[PDB]
Amino acid sequence: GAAWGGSYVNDFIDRGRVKKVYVMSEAKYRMLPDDIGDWYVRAADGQMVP
Amino acid sequence: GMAYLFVRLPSSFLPDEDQGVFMTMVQLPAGATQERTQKVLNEVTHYYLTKEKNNVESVFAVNGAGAAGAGQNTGIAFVSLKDWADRPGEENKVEAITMRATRAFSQIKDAMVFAFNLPAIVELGTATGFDFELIDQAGLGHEKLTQARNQLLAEAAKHPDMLTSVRPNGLEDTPQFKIDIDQEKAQALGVSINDINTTLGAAWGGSYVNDFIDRGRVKKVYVMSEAKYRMLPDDIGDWYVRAADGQMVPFSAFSSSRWEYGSPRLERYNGLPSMEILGQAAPGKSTGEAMELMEQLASKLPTGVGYDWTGMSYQERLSGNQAPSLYAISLIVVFLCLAALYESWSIPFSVMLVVPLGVIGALLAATFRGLTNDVYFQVGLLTTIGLSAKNAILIVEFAK
Amino acid sequence: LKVNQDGSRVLLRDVAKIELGGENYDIIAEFNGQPASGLGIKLATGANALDTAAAIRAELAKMEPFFPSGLKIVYPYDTTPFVKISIHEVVKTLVEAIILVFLVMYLFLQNFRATLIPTIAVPVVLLGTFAVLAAFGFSINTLTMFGMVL
Amino acid sequence: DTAAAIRAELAKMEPFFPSGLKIVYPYDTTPFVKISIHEVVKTLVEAIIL
Amino acid sequence: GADAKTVQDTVTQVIEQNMNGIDNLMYMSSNSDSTGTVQITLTFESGTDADIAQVQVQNKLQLAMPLLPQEVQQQGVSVEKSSSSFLMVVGVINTDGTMTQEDISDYVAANMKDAISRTSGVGDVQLFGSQYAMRIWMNPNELNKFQLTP
Amino acid sequence: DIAQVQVQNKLQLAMPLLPQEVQQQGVSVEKSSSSFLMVVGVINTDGTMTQEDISDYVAANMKDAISRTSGVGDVQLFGSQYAMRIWMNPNELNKFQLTPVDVITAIKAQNAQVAAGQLGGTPPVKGQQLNASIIAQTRLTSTEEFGKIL
Amino acid sequence: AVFVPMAFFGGSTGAIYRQFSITIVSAMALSVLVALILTPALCATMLKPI
């Protein structure tokens, strides 16, 4: 969800005005359906599954 | 002489009364402990209680609020007086009393004490000069708005001819205590930043946990270190957090501290960082040109600082704006109905001339009483001209 | 709070004072420097006159007898009997105008009938006015009564 | 009303704007309502002298 | 427990952004205290509807309430509409000495304020003192003795 | 106006049954025509700013104020205010055995504001002189700052 | 005619000018009506022959 769709995390301050902080993969990893394979999650032991 | 009596005569909005009660303001430096404030409240009370028994009935005094805000250095008195028939004289009316009080308090060192009468009614404090506000119109911060407001505060208290008592209304950049959690020492020592910040916040600032029940009524449960561990900056070292392994680190390890500076009553007006400004015109001058002078002194200020009038300066009030326009179209309506009753155009002028003969003895009463042209007066004036109208109207309607 | 390898018990009171205290400890009031709490009471835009001020004494008459030993009110602040000797000393003035004019009348219309004529003519024309005042929303304030005086 | 208010808030903003920042007004159901009513005064006048 | 700025960014700023399309308004005054308080006042035309002007804000106050700290709506936000001038102040004094001031404050806060405040037209009651509250005053020497934090 | 809140009574008869994710953003409730009134465009003339800058300058200096003016029932911005953008790389996230979660959490961790009481606050030990606020972890303000997160 | 255009108008201030214009034009009409209702009548039944 965060990778492909972004995520609003918390807010920051930008010259005495509060604004957002979003987090989201570079566009070089979400254009193609093959790019799902490039993503790794850390399994309970320690190893990372794609 | 009518017109001249009319412009030599000053202009109130509504007379203050002796409303039976009045108040007193107490403001210390900061940080200033609560106890010090209490010392000065004891003083102030000792006055209204020893040096005024014949007039005072009750002083209700409160360490903890002000008409600016809460603070340990905020203090206020609620004074009620013995009945009017029981203090006969001017010596014993609000004016003289709050006067000699303010004059007497004047004394106290490092304690700003001033006592005042309640300005007439409700939140109709829309008199007494002005209320000016600087506006951070760019990205400037608190520093540059401090300094810019100082440039103003400065350059205007060097014009004591149509502008005086020019101070900020707020509270003042008291020093603060910075704590710095170098995060890496916290991960390396195995301590939850959550745990750190939690314990710091609860220890030194309290924490509402959940609610309990106290004789069939629900109330709070707070949690907070004994006062013997939060008076001194050294006491941060006495606090331990349980590291991930099991060992307990003191803050001494992963924190670094130091003193700094910054406001305790940050202000905004209409979105942006603002600071609000106070004071009057100057004993021969009106609020209007005073305002202009402020608008002009403001002009010479750094790029990005704007200004705005709120409060009593938004509105602007009464006689001198468009109230003689009211007297005027009222007069036009009158000469109209008189051209209706006489069916002339001249003949009503025999009743128009009847007017100055009344404003003359009105205005006379005014300046010769120390009094001054206000709402009460102006309705007296209206009534005047209306009655004289009646008189003349009847004589000439008789004659024709 | 925790039990030990010792088998020892650690209780809350073992690491803290427990005590019925206050949510906040920054408000300390006194009345003639005797300690004393109270209520400071505000008014909601569009209110409602000596109404609300009577209502206070409602809710409170309702409270005075379940109060503990030696708990007694005082009233250190009152924009109330101001609004009460304000309006009173207007009735007074109306009255005064009436008899003063009764006697200025008597000094020219030297008979108790011609004199009693503009007498009756005065309350009527007042009284009525209040009826018209209700009829447009204006209440018997200080200003209204000064209207009735001028 | 509201259309004047816009030019209120904005007259209030025009001078703290950065270098080379300038408005334009690509849309305006305003001076329509302004030559509408004007060309009515005109007609009233005309009826009168005719 | 908050500092001015902490509050100012975290709360004040974050309501202010979300205050709009509230009718007939003139301006928005915004204080932010080192006692961890904030306060925001909106002003409307003279003669304007107190009540609609009253919620219209709080439509918006809860267009943001889930963007405030847990810690802040655990306490809870209030929304008044009221004069700043009091009306009266009623003080409570015990006469024998049988109760301190904190007791008195509590007895009122738990028997008197609720009821008075519940009466119409009474737009804010400010208590001079504080209702009770269970107070757990922790000791650090003894917390660490048993390897415990807050 | 009544038709306006009457909905939002109900909108918050359900708001806690919507995602965290959805009232983190926040729900809005307008009452307004769909036809615009005017559209005011902002263009830089030298080229000194892109469109994203322009959009931001307005979103942070112009929209708030215009929108705060009565009768203005919805402002739709043509662009978007700024926002700190952390564009993650997956090759490098897995290189260090990291997912997104760890980024998310290092951020809630290191970009925040905490509230941490005072020095010599109430209640105090009698005989104290000093009374100041404590300041702690305070929000971030620069890109670099976000860069150097641990 | 003297009292009415004082109910006009502006501010926090003019509120008060309403509080008299009305309160006194009222007594006007009441007085002058009485003046042709009650006064002439009671100045007929109660005056003593000259």
The 3-state DSSP class for residue F72 equals coil
Which of F28, C17, B280 lies closest to E59, judged by CA? F28
**H-type alpha helices, F12-50:** 20-25
C144's tokens = 């209204």
Architecture of domain B174-262: 2-Layer Sandwich (3.30)
CA-based nearest distance F30→chain B, Å: 21
Residues 6+ apart with CB under 8 A from B375: B13, B14, B318, G13, G16, G17
G17 and chain B: CB distance < 8 Å anywhere? Answer: yes
B93's tokens = 């009316």
Residue B164 pairs in a beta bridge with B280
Nearest CA in chain E to A14: E9
- CB-CB neighbors (< 8 A) of D16 in chain B: 137-138, 303-304, 306
- CB-CB neighbors (< 8 A) of G20 in chain B: 379
The domain containing residue E7 runs over which residues? 1-82
Contact: B246, E132; criterion CB under 8 Å:
no
Contact F87, A30 (CB under 8 A): no
Chain F residue set in contact with D, beta carbons under 8 Å: 36-49, 54, 57, 61-62, 65-66, 68-72
Please count the other Cβ atoms lying within 10 Å of the Cβ belonging to residue A1. Answer: 9
Cis peptide before E44 (omega within 30 of 0): no
- CB-CB neighbors (< 8 A) of C17 in chain E: 135-137, 139
Cβ-Cβ contacts under 8 Å between D and F: the total is 74
Cα→Cα distances A42→B192, C75, F6, F100, Å: 21, 70, 48, 10
Contact: E23, F138; criterion CB under 8 Å:
no
CATH of residue E14's domain is: 3.30.70.1430
Residue that has been written with the tokens 């769709």 in this structure: A5
Distance from C-alpha of C73 to C-alpha of E117, rounded to nearest angstrom: 17
Contact: E23, F116; criterion CB under 8 Å:
no
B198's tokens = 């939690």
What is the three-state SS of chain B?
CHHHHHHHCCCCCCCCCCCCEEEEEEECCCCCCHHHHHHHHHHHHHHHHHCCCCCEEEEEEEECCCCCCCCCCEEEEEEEECCHHHCCCCCCCHHHHHHHHHHHHCCCCCCEEEEECCCCECCECCCCCCCEEEEECCCCCCHHHHHHHHHHHHHHCCCCCCCECCCECCCCCCEEEEEEECHHHHHHHCCCHHHHHHHHHHHHHCEEEEEEECCCCEEEEEEEECHHHCCCHHHHHHCEEECCCCCEEEHHHHEEEEEEECCCEEEEECCEEEEEECCECCCCCCHHHHHHHHHHHHHCCCCCEEEEECHHHHHCCCCCCCHHHHHHHHHHHHHHHHHHHCCCCCCCHHHHCCCHHHHHHHHHHHHCCCCCCCHHHHHHHHHHHHHHHHHHHHHHHHHC
Please count the other Cβ atoms lying within 10 Å of the Cβ belonging to residue D11. Answer: 9
What sign for the dihedral angle of Cα B321, B322, B323, B328?
positive
Contact: G22, C124; criterion CB under 8 Å:
no
Q: Give the closest of B34, B181, B203 to F124, CB-based.
A: B34
Say which CATH topology domain B19-123 has: Alpha-Beta Plaits (3.30.70)
Q: Do B124-173+271-314 and B174-262 fold alike per CATH?
A: no
Amino acid sitting at position B363: L
Cα→Cα distances B108→B332, F25, G18, Å: 59, 54, 46
Contact: B72, F131; criterion CB under 8 Å:
yes
Per CATH, domain B124-173+271-314 is 3.30.70.1440: yes
Contact B286, B140 (CB under 8 A): no
Distance from C-alpha of C15 to C-alpha of C1, rounded to nearest angstrom: 9
What is the C-alpha R_g of chain E? 20
Residue A21 pairs in a beta bridge with A10, F84
E114's tokens = 């609720």
Contact B182, B255 (CB under 8 A): yes
Q: Which chains touch A (3 or more CB pairs under 8 A)?
A: B, E, F
Distance from C-alpha of F119 to C-alpha of F134, rounded to nearest angstrom: 7
CA-based nearest distance B270→chain G, Å: 21
Contact B204, B220 (CB under 8 A): no
Q: Which chains touch E (3 or more CB pairs under 8 A)?
A: A, B, C, F, G
Q: Give the closest of B33, B177, B232 to F134, CB-based.
A: B177
Residue B74 pairs in a beta bridge with B27
* Chain D, window 1-30: residues with a beta carbon less than 8 angstroms from a chain B beta carbon: 12, 16
- DSSP 8-state symbol, G47: P
**H-type alpha helices, A1-50:** 2-5
G44's tokens = 């007929």
Phi and psi of F114, rounded to 5°?
-120, 155
Contact B136, B274 (CB under 8 A): yes
- CB-CB neighbors (< 8 A) of G18 in chain C: 138
Residues composing chain B: 400
Contact: F123, C24; criterion CB under 8 Å:
no
Distance from C-alpha of E133 to C-alpha of E130, rounded to nearest angstrom: 9
B186's tokens = 């916290």
Output b/e per residue, D30-43; b: 16+ Cβ within 10 A. Answer: eeeeeeeeeeeeee
Distance from C-alpha of C36 to C-alpha of E128, rounded to nearest angstrom: 9
Resolution in angstroms comes to: 3.4
Contact E23, F71 (CB under 8 A): yes
The 3-state DSSP class for residue C61 equals helix
Contact: E10, F68; criterion CB under 8 Å:
no
CA-based nearest distance A33→chain F, Å: 15
Cα→Cα distances B66→B104, B122, B356, F91, Å: 20, 17, 50, 60
A16's tokens = 């005495």
F24's tokens = 């983190």
Output b/e per residue, B175-214; b: 16+ Cβ within 10 A. Answer: ebbebebebeebeeeebbbebbbbbbbbbbbbbeeeeeeb
Which of C129, B217, B242, A10 lies closest to E131, judged by CA? B217
Residue that has been written with the tokens 């600032």 in this structure: B205
